[PDB]
């Protein structure tokens, strides 16, 4: 898993860079200002694998709750709306890898 992750995550990790000048500004400051609440909670579910309880992690994203609402300007809405999905779903494998580590 580790090696193929090394590339898959980076695949969607650079979709943020295009948005910066697609919307014409350094989106980092905005997005950080646009954040005051999480939406991706993880459950350390216990799986008694062969009589041993192992802390597996539940890759649970919250679509009914958003970050500190500051979304879209008029020049990059679609890119951000697809990024918050693709690069967010690039985290379920992360949750599973953490479970594997534990």
């Amino acid at each position: 898993a580790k090696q193929k992750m090394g590339r898959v995550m980076q695949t969607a990790a650079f979709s943020l860079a295009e948005v910066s000048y697609a919307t014409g500004e350094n989106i980092g400051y905005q997005v950080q200002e646009s954040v005051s609440t999480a939406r991706f909670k993880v459950r350390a579910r216990q799986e008694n694998v062969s009589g041993v309880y192992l802390s597996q992690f539940e890759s649970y994203i919250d679509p009914e709750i958003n970050d500190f609402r500051l979304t879209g300007l008029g020049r990059g809405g679609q890119q951000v709306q697809r990024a918050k999905e693709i690069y967010s779903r690039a985290v379920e494998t992360l949750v599973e890898l953490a479970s594997l580590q534990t």
Binding site: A38, F40, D62, D67
Partner: protein, 115 residues
């Protein structure tokens, strides 16, 4: 068992952008006990990195997973190996602009030996 549901990040704000978009916690508005960290690679001190790493590791039993840039992972490698506890799960992210380096994953380093 959700005794730790917060995902700490010590990595560049560039990387932290999409993470916060997906949600990695929040800034705690009673003592500014933020569930993450902001760092500039190769141009900001590591003492604050070590302090926040101690905070998330031993002073925070609620941190689900600490995500650390591989760059930072080797920057504070001593600290990285210092704290090895499963529940505060540690997964070192290959840092943006720093291609996947298995040598930069301490847990993967343990995955080297005894095999």
């Amino acid at each position: 068992a959700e005794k730790r549901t917060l995902i700490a990040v010590i990595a560049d704000e560039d990387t932290t952008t999409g993470l916060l978009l997906a949600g990695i916690g929040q800034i705690t508005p009673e003592t500014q006990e933020k569930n993450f960290f902001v760092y500039q690679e190769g141009k900001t001190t590591k003492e604050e990195i070590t302090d926040k790493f101690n905070h998330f590791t031993e002073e925070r039993d609620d941190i689900a997973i600490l995500l650390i840039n591989q760059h930072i992972a080797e920057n504070i490698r001593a600290r990285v190996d210092s704290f090895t506890n499963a529940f505060p799960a540690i997964l070192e992210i290959p840092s943006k602009d720093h291609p996947y380096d298995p040598e930069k994953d301490s847990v993967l380093k343990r995955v080297r030996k005894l095999f």
